[PDB]
């Protein structure tokens, strides 16, 4: 059965925007589409690379299912819940996208992350991830401790390295920073590899597609 | 197979006291059952249907789980309520915030039901739940719901000027459902294992 979205956009729902108004009871869908004009796109301001292509891809799909691939509790050396923004409120307090994790420093340390997930499913997996472009240098230290950082994402078909662009930008939803989100289709038996020492927005939930 | 008489699908799932096609009684306490038609379609293609306890009534040590009853759902001449769901009300002069979570560790899909009470007036809101302005939060990996009780006087159905709204979802294996409320919460006690 099709997934028709109201108010929330595709990017907002995939990432898990708190502000999205939607009652949803059956976790089994054929395909997913958004309204011609979505009220809320991203709660924390930013960009979604290859957005138009992804929306087209999720249109002609026979089966759509949501799965957890990297548990939030598996980040034993980093802080996976404290990182939150007022731009993404939940019950009055600061929160974040539900399906991805805003990792921040634990104590005075942000150890280098080396994590890899292999798609052991029989279906293609839609994996999403992101990078945070902080307001200034002071915020960079505050959140991730390390001054100069990077994000490395590799698969058999993808090679990506990201460096956070630290700059003060106009306030959207009270934020002077931005986040950039990326995605790929992880084939069965293919693995995705992550490496980062800061500014990493890690996936928790991916989507099985047919 | 389970062929029902007189009692409705919604009535049997919730546990309507007089209940144990065209149903004479849908809901004993008046209200609505959201996505009813969809639920019936879902309960059509089922190979195995089984009832399970996920939240014991005795686990509510800070709230009153038995006193809340209505004349709309009588049993043996006296007031009663749906058997499978719990009408939580204030214990003493207090209704502490509820933060409860159940995780489905079974190998089958779980049909979970819950509800909200839309009380007659403000005086009744305080009488039952103490707190004046309240909310209900229901969360899973795929579901995000926030409810606010609509306080209004409505026409008397089964002697009631209030209403109740009931909701449901399918909790997948290894997925958890989370509840948060400071009032008007009609909490699940029993869920249903289903197999396609």
């Amino acid at each position: 059965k099709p997934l028709i979205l109201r108010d929330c956009s595709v990017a907002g729902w995939l990432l898990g925007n708190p502000m999205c108004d939607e009652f949803i009871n059956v976790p089994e869908w054929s395909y997913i589409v958004e309204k011609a004009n979505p009220v809320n796109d991203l709660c924390y301001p930013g960009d979604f690379n290859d957005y138009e292509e992804l929306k087209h891809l999720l249109s002609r799909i026979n089966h759509f299912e949501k799965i957890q691939i990297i548990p939030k509790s598996s980040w034993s050396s980093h802080e996976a819940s404290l990182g939150v923004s007022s731009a993404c409120p939940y019950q009055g307090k600061s929160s974040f996208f539900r399906n991805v994790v805003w990792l921040i420093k634990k104590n005075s340390t942000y150890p280098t992350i080396k994590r890899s997930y292999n798609n052991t499913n029989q279906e293609d997996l839609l994996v999403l991830w992101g990078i945070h472009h902080p307001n200034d240098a002071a915020e960079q230290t505050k959140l991730y401790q390390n001054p100069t950082t990077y994000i490395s994402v590799g698969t058999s078909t993808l090679n990506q390295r990201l460096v956070p662009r630290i700059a003060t930008r106009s306030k959207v939803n009270g934020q002077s920073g931005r986040m950039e989100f990326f995605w790929t289709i992880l084939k069965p038996n293919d693995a995705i590899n992550f490496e980062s020492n800061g500014n990493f927005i890690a996936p928790e939930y991916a989507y099985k597609i047919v | 197979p389970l062929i029902l008489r007189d009692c409705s699908v919604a009535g049997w799932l919730l546990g309507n006291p007089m209940c144990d096609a065209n149903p004479v009684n849908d809901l004993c306490y008046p209200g609505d059952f959201n996505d009813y038609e969809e639920l019936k379609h879902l309960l059509s293609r089922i190979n195995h249907f089984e009832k399970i306890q996920i939240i014991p009534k005795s686990s509510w040590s800070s709230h009153e789980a038995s006193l809340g009853v209505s004349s709309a759902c009588p049993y043996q001449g006296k007031s009663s309520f749906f058997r499978n769901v719990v009408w939580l009300i204030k214990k003493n002069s207090t209704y502490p915030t509820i933060k409860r979570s159940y995780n489905n560790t079974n190998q089958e899909d779980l049909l979970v039901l819950w509800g909200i009470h839309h009380p007659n007036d403000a005086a009744e809101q305080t009488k039952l739940y103490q707190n004046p302005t309240t909310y209900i939060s229901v969360g899973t990996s795929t579901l995000n719901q926030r409810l606010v009780p609509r306080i209004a006087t409505r026409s008397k159905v089964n002697g009631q000027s209030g209403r109740m709204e009931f909701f449901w979802t399918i909790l997948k294996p290894n997925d958890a459902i989370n509840f948060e409320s400071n009032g008007n919460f009609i909490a699940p006690e029993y869920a249903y294992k289903i197999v396609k």
């Epitope: 404290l82 939150v84 009055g92 921040i104 915020e139 505050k142 | 302005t133 909310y135 606010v148 009032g183």
Partner: antibody, heavy 123, light 106 residues
Framework: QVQLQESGPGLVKPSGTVSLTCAVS?????????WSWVRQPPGKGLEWIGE???????NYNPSLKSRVTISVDKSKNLFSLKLSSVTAADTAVYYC????????????????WGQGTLVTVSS | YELTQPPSVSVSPGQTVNITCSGD??????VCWYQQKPGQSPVLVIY???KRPSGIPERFSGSNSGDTATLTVSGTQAMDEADYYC?????????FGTGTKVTVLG
Amino acid sequence: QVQLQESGPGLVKPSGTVSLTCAVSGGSISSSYWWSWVRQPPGKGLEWIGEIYHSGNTNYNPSLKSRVTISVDKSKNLFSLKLSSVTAADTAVYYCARVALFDILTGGWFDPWGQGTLVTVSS
Amino acid sequence: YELTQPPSVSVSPGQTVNITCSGDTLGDKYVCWYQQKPGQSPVLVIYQDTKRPSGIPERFSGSNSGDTATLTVSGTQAMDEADYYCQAWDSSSFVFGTGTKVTVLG
């Protein structure tokens, strides 16, 4: 400018209930702000009591959670404090304040404060 | 959660005084500072570690690292003599420091 004003009985007998109200002017209760109570006994430090959101959401000091209640009246644009089973240790000046969220991370800052009001617990 | 402050500090007029605030893993939290004069309400001087509210003189500054946050007042004046509190958040609870009395030596 937003102004906050406390009022209530300045004298309360032991085992009784401290009942205070905070009037909010220049702003609406229905905001992205939180509304909190803070107390200070004479010649001592500040102590966070609890807070409330316009939706009804609350958070209390765990050491006071047993006997504390905070409610909100959107129609009269005020919020209130109830502290039951009071003792001599509950004698303090009580402040109401407005709490604002950080753009990033948990927590917030208290601004503005009310003038405060002294509540004496003595039989 | 406990926030520890020194009970008192002294400083000559015109000089700079620093007020410290210590707690477990304080460096991950945003810290705020309040000025309170006897019989008056607390006044926000520093929020979010380093930010100043409007109407607060530039000579006030703050910093945070490790387990210690520091309120800094340069070119101190007689009107700066007051009690100072630091504040943070932890586990659904707001926490205030024990308080530091700053005396300008007159």
